[PDB]
Amino acid sequence: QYSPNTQQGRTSIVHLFEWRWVDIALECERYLAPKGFGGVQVSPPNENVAIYNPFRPWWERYQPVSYKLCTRSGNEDEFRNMVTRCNNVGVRIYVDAVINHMCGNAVSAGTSSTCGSYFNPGSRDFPAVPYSGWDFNDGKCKTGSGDIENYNDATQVRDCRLTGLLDLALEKDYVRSKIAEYMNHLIDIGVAGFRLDASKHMWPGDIKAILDKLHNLNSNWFPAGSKPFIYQEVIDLGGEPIKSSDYFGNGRVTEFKYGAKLGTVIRKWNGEKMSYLKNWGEGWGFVPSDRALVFVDNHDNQRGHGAGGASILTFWDARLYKMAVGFMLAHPYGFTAVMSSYRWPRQFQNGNDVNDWVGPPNNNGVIKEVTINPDTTCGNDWVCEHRWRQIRNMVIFRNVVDGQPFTNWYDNGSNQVAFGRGNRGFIVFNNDDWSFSLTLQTGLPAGTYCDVISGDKINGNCTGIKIYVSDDGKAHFSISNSAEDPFIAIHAESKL
């Protein structure tokens, strides 16, 4: 469960948030495969409630109606086609599994679903599964509202409705079986793993019982006996009865402290400085590296819909964002997940964005295709951070130094730091309010290296800055505090 199952040499996954199956298939062959990406996390592929007020919000996909592979992203045939094409080019697919609940109990009965399936939250009737009143925790929950009111109570957090979402009785073999049936269908199609949504709201034992009924990965692409990669979405920030470690037996867990702390440091908040990142990792109270899934931001907290809140860095803060993602990709702690989002009309009303519900680029509900501009960027309002030179080149950086130890760390006691990875890569950061000009030990063999942040290496040529490493692995670095990108990165594969 703990192994990503990615092709050897691929160390990251990208969350192509709300992308259509056909666009992901193309992206796999035209970009992800050749640029070294390990995998892709897709939005929930199962049928959900169609919400028209607001209008097709992004969160409607976290309200299941059935387990039919029928969504705004595409149908079953298109999903199968995408998984096959991606696996054929060495890019894995990870599915966002929404198995803790169904749709909101206050949602109107009818056929307002992505596949026309009928459902009735009022009577707990979901005939397309099929599920009935006997498959929910309405009798288990002992709160007055029926929803979760006390997070200091593990039992209600697990047996009560999370913000009104119908809570499934995962202790029932029938329900566990229906879920495993859905996940096994996806495994046979070819998915390499799953993101367990709202894992904190499920008992670790119930999850285990479900994983027990899962098949091994498709033997056409994976070695026999291969188990699906499992990462559970658990928001653990410190003083709650429920701990991330409670889920270590099922697989990896999302480390939400990673992005929250990194954002605070990069922003130079609460007195933090990049100099403290010397012991970054478990030393900061994070879960063991071999059990962590890290990221700077995600679809939830990038809108303020999650853990971290205000310190979270996202594409809106491009300069600091690129620096944060760069540091994460260069650091050996955990398995890294990169975010890929879309732009929305942000509107704040006293510190709160009233348009945080806005769904993906669309034409009257129909998701707009991802267009590629001549400069390899995306159009139609898709941000495509994974296509940003500074981010994509750092993704490759992590692959190149995969395995090398954290070494040659340097810091000025403030916000100017540098460190290498064995003898395969070196990165320098200048987050202070003054220029950086110093000769440092890189631990890299002598030669001319192309800075992969300001440019690229193309057939014995650099399109950006060039770094000269001498015989003793020493090299000079100059980064102005006013530089577009205040950091430099070089590695074994960027050497001329």
Catalytic residues: 197, 233
Q: How far apart are CA 91 and CA 38, in angstroms?
A: 6
Residue 49 pairs with which residues in a beta bridge? 113
CA angle 229, 92, 334 (to 5 degrees): 50
**CA pair distance 59, 358, nearest whole angstrom:** 9
- As a whole number of Å, the CA-based R_g of the chain is 23
When asked if residue 233 is in the footprint of Ca ion (CB under 5 A), the reply is: no
User: From the DSSP assignment, how many helices (H) and strands (E) are in the chain?
Assistant: 8, 20
Q: Least distance (Å) from Ca ion to the CB of residue 303?
A: 24
Nearer to Ca ion, 49 or 169 (CB): 169
- Judged by CB under 5 A, the number of residues near Ca ion is 4
Separation CA 381–CA 387 (nearest Å): 14
- Distance (Å, whole) CA 479 – CA 468: 15
Residue with Cβ nearer Ca ion (70 or 183): 183
Shorter beta-carbon distance to Ca ion: residue 1 or 137? 137
Find the part of the chain contacting Ca ion (CB under 5 A) among 27-35, 159-167, 236-244, 329-337.
Answer: 159-167
Minimum CB separation from Ca ion for residue 93, in Å? Answer: 26
Residue (158 or 421) nearer to Ca ion, CB: 158
- Cβ pair 347, 354 in contact under 8 A: yes
Count of CB atoms situated within 10 Å of the CB of 43: 24
CB of 163 to Ca ion, least distance (A): 12
Residue 363, CB half-sphere, CA atoms under 13 Å: how many? 3
Least separation in angstroms between CB 201 and Ca ion? 4
Round to whole Å and give the CA distance between 260 and 302: 11
Q: Are 158 and 203 in contact (CB under 8 A)?
A: yes
- Among 27, 78, 135, 167, which residue interacts with Ca ion (rule: CB under 5 A)? 167
Nearer to Ca ion, 100 or 105 (CB): 100
Helix (H) or strand (E) holding 257: helix 256-266
Q: Closest Cα partner for 332 from 455, 445, 425?
A: 425
Judged by CB under 5 A, which stretch of 143-151, 157-165, 226-234, 323-331 contacts Ca ion?
Answer: 157-165
- Asked if 451 is part of the footprint of Ca ion (rule: CB under 5 A), the reply reads no
Binding pattern for the stretch 43-82 against Ca ion, x by CB under 5 A and - elsewhere = ----------------------------------------
Nearest Cα neighbor of 176 from 127, 210, 134 is 210
CB of 166 to Ca ion, least distance (A): 10
The three-state (H, E, C) secondary structure of 319-366, written as one string? HHHHHHHHHHHHCCCCEEEEEECECCCCCECCCCECCCCCCCCEECCE
CB of 461 to Ca ion, least distance (A): 56
Do the beta carbons of residue 196 and residue 132 sit within 8 Å?
no
Least separation, in Å, of the C-beta of 337 and Ca ion? Answer: 24
**Integer CA distances (angstroms), 332 to 370, 390, 405, 489, in order:** 32, 18, 8, 15
CB closer to Ca ion out of 158 and 227: 158
Nearest position to Ca ion, beta carbon: 201
**Residue span binding Ca ion (CB under 5 A) among the ranges 77-85, 160-168, 403-411, 448-456:** 160-168
Among 5-13, 165-173, 271-279, 322-330, the segment contacting Ca ion (CB under 5 A): 165-173
In the complex, what is the shortest distance from the CB of residue 14 to Ca ion, in angstroms, rounded to a whole number?
29
Other C-beta atoms lying within 10 Å of the C-beta of residue 411: 17
Cβ proximity to Ca ion: between 191 and 207 the closer is 207
Per DSSP, the residues of 273-322 read: -GGGGGG-SGGGTPPPGGGEEE-S--TTTTTT-STTTTS---GGGHHHHH
- From 123-131, 200-208, 404-412, 438-446, span contacting Ca ion (CB under 5 A): 200-208
Q: Which of residues 92-151 bind Ca ion (CB under 5 A)?
A: 100
Nearer to Ca ion, 199 or 399 (CB): 199
201 sits near Ca ion (criterion: CB under 5 A): yes
Instruction: List residues near Ca ion by CB under 5 A.
Output: 100, 158, 167, 201
